[PDB]
Amino acid sequence: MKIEEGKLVIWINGDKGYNGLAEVGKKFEKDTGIKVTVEHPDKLEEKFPQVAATGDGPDIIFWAHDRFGGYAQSGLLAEITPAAAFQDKLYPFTWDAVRYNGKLIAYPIAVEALSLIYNKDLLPNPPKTWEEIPALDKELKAKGKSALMFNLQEPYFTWPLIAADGGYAFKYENGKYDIKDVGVDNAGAKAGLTFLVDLIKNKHMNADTDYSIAEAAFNKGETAMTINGPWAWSNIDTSAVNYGVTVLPTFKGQPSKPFVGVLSAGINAASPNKELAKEFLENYLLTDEGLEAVNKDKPLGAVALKSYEEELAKDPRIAATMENAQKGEIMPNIPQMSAFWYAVRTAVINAASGRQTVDAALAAAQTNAAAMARPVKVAELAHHLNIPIWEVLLPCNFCTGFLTYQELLEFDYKDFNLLWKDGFVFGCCAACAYRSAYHEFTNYHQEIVVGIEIEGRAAANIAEIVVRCLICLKRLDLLEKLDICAQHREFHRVRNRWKGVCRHCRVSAAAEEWMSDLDDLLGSQ
Ligand SMILES: OC[C@H]1O[C@H](O[C@H]2[C@H](O)[C@@H](O)[C@@H](O[C@H]3[C@H](O)[C@@H](O)[C@@H](O[C@H]4[C@H](O)[C@@H](O)[C@@H](O)O[C@@H]4CO)O[C@@H]3CO)O[C@@H]2CO)[C@H](O)[C@@H](O)[C@@H]1O
Ligand SMILES: [Zn+2]
Ligand SMILES: [Zn+2]
């Protein structure tokens, strides 16, 4: 479905000040007459790339900067072009986190970092090292309480300990990041995760402790310490708990390295209100009047606005937030970060629950992260290899030839997908492309429809149906499909896929693997 013009729909995570932002949306409504609707769906960071690719989705997407690069690579975000004076209104390093391929793709909002939150009534002077926490918990068990309870279901909360001794996501030496080099199955990461598992072995922590269980246990004085961010400061105030925000403990003397997140706001590429959403994000809801209103509901930490960050720089809770931030490192915004987080989430959960040893869980995370971040397009492959496209030597999957430079560019032009077999990567040459389309169309042809009849047969609008050229396999754009409708021409259903003629073209066991390889070549979308 298409987005309604004249209305702003904003998606933001549930643990943020969405009520504090909805009140700012009404201030923009009093001056412009445009209602600003906020929504906090579950798994919005995953549902957004599902619906933004079909033109649907909200107008503004709120998340930490690590996810936006994947949205920009998929062509889901609109380029942010602020004024030269507006870029100096915010800190320069916050803009570096929202730049992808030399282009601003989001608005920096606030810098987030984990910190050690403890109950001062139940723990004076928290420990400076993780190693003395088992001894500290044994004393509090006699008092009927526990020492530390934080979220163990999201790797964001456990990564400070894992990265303290050598664990890293993607290694960056001199230029960019190294996708093939992931630092999850190293000696330092195995040490950090082992200490976390032994904490669960000795009944000092519970593997099923999530976000709300660790929050309720700290908002009721049941546990002494809890690791969380600035957004969870308001729930502790309403619970009347004398707490403190201090530095995270160290492991092997080395300080914990939390992954620093810059909350950002991106504009949907299919939004009919790009200028309306830009006016809200820039002038009439980002200044000190807007950031202060959102901070009332859920605190944001060290904001990116200079005129407002100095008014809270002397905050003891925010001062420690920046101390853990400098001892950590900023999250990459590369599209491969989703593969990293998915692999580490499984590793921590499987290790904590005892389903895998720490060694096996981290070894599999290394393999899974690389296997999920592997290039799908020729351009991505050349960038992965840090070589120009014409230096790529890509075997064809369907014959013994290697692709020419033109065939390499045509591979991505026709929206093909790289094939991975036995470690080798494969493409498809021009002759095999046309040869596969002919065999597919002359052996698996199912039905014919005339123009707009495809919408009923496919149960989808013409814009949302994936149609490829029955001759050259290229993906048809919206105008090619509408032209077939206007000219009353034929759409064909072949191998449960829809085919047509692009504006440019005119006219047993070995075959099953052939047609199976063609499925992976064309993909689902
Ligand atoms: O089991 C599948 C799970 O998938 C969903 O969560 C995923 C996300 O899709 C990924 O984006 C990633 O999440 C990262 C996140 O990208 C990163 O910003 C950071 O998130 C912080 C955030 O910065 C901070 O502002 C605050 O909101 O806390 C967040 C962490 O709780 O770290 C995340 C990694 O933990 O990886 C997770 C999966 O690990 C989906 O939301 C899950 O429900 C689902 O189970
Ligand atoms: Zn070939
Ligand atoms: Zn064609």
DSSP string, 42-53: TTHHHHHHHHHT
Q: What share of the chain is helix, strand, coil (3-state, %, to 5)?
A: 45, 20, 40
Q: Which atom of ligand 1 is nearest to the CA of 261?
A: 23
DSSP-derived letter for residue 329 is E
Residue of 413, 438, 441 lying closest to 427 (CA atoms): 413
Give me ligand 1 centre to Cα 342, in Å.
9
Interatomic CA distance for residues 498 and 469, integer angstroms: 9
Provide the 10 A C-beta neighbour count for residue 252.
14
Q: Which two tokens stand for residue 341?
A: 């987080």
Question: H helices then E strands: how many in the chain?
Answer: 22, 21
Give me ligand 2 centre to Cα 143, in Å.
72
Q: Which two tokens stand for residue 4?
A: 């309604």
CATH 3.40.190.10 domain range(s) in the chain: 8-112+261-330, 115-257+336-372
Which protein residue's CA is at the shortest distance from atom 42 of ligand 1? 43
Dmax (CA) for the chain in angstroms is 84
Q: Which pairs from 171-180 meet CB under 8 Å and 24+ separation?
A: 172/332, 177/332, 177/334, 177/336, 179/334, 179/336, 179/370, 179/373, 179/384, 180/370, 180/384
Ligand positioned closest to the Cα atom of 473: 3
Give me ligand 2 centre to Cα 246, in Å.
61
Q: Which atom of ligand 1 is nearest to the CA of 263?
A: 25
Superfamily of domain 377-525 in the CATH hierarchy: E6 early regulatory protein (3.30.240.40)
For a mutational test of ligand 1's pocket, the pick from 13, 42, 45, 115, i.e. the residue with the most ligand atoms closer than 8 A to its C-beta, is 45
In DSSP terms, 129 is beta-bridged to 250
Residue of 242, 239, 203 lying closest to 219 (CA atoms): 239
Ligand positioned closest to the Cα atom of 436: 2
Q: Which atom of ligand 1 is nearest to the CA of 64?
A: 18
Task: Calculate the alpha carbon distances from 233 to 114, 216, 229, 242 in Å.
Answer: 12, 13, 8, 11
In DSSP terms, 500 is beta-bridged to 469
Give me ligand 3 centre to Cα 24, in Å.
50
Give me ligand 1 centre to Cα 169, in Å.
15
Give me ligand 1 centre to Cα 155, in Å.
8
Residue 370 contacts residue 183 (beta carbons within 8 Å): no
| Cα 81 from chain centre | 22
Out of 3.40.50.300, 1.20.120.80, 3.40.190.10, 1.10.287.70, which CATH number does the structure's domain 8-112+261-330 have? 3.40.190.10
Residue 412 contacts residue 505 (beta carbons within 8 Å): no
CATH, domain range 115-257+336-372: 3.40.190.10
Helix (H) or strand (E) holding 469: strand 467-469
In DSSP terms, 467 is beta-bridged to 498
Ligand positioned closest to the Cα atom of 433: 2
| Cα 333 from chain centre | 8
Beta carbons within 8 Å of 330's beta carbon, 6+ residues apart? 93, 96, 97, 259, 260, 262
DSSP-derived letter for residue 331 is P
DSSP-derived letter for residue 239 is T
Give me ligand 2 centre to Cα 504, in Å.
22
Q: Which pairs from 507-516 meet CB under 8 Å and 24+ separation?
A: 507/471, 511/439, 511/443, 514/398, 514/436, 514/439, 515/439, 515/440, 515/444
Give me ligand 3 centre to Cα 474, in Å.
6
CATH 3.30.240.40 domain range(s) in the chain: 377-525
Give me ligand 1 centre to Cα 276, in Å.
29
Ligand positioned closest to the Cα atom of 48: 1
Which protein residue's CA is at the shortest distance from atom 33 of ligand 1? 156
Q: Which atom of ligand 1 is nearest to the CA of 155?
A: 35
Interatomic CA distance for residues 516 and 525, integer angstroms: 16
Beta carbons within 8 Å of 9's beta carbon, 6+ residues apart? 3, 37, 39, 58, 59, 60
Interatomic CA distance for residues 439 and 422, integer angstroms: 26
* Helix pair angle (155-162, 337-352), 10° resolution: 80
Which protein residue's CA is at the shortest distance from atom 22 of ligand 1? 64
Ligand positioned closest to the Cα atom of 399: 2
DSSP-derived letter for residue 272 is T
Interatomic CA distance for residues 255 and 324, integer angstroms: 9
Task: Calculate the alpha carbon distances from 320 to 73, 263, 302, 325, 362 in Å.
Answer: 34, 18, 10, 8, 30
Neighbour-count burial of 324, counting CB atoms closer than 10 A to its CB (0-12 exposed, 13-18 middle, 19+ buried): buried
For ligand 1, residues with CB inside 6 Å are 13, 15, 43, 45-46, 64, 66-67, 112, 154-156, 229, 261, 338, 341-342, 345
Interatomic CA distance for residues 1 and 50, integer angstroms: 12
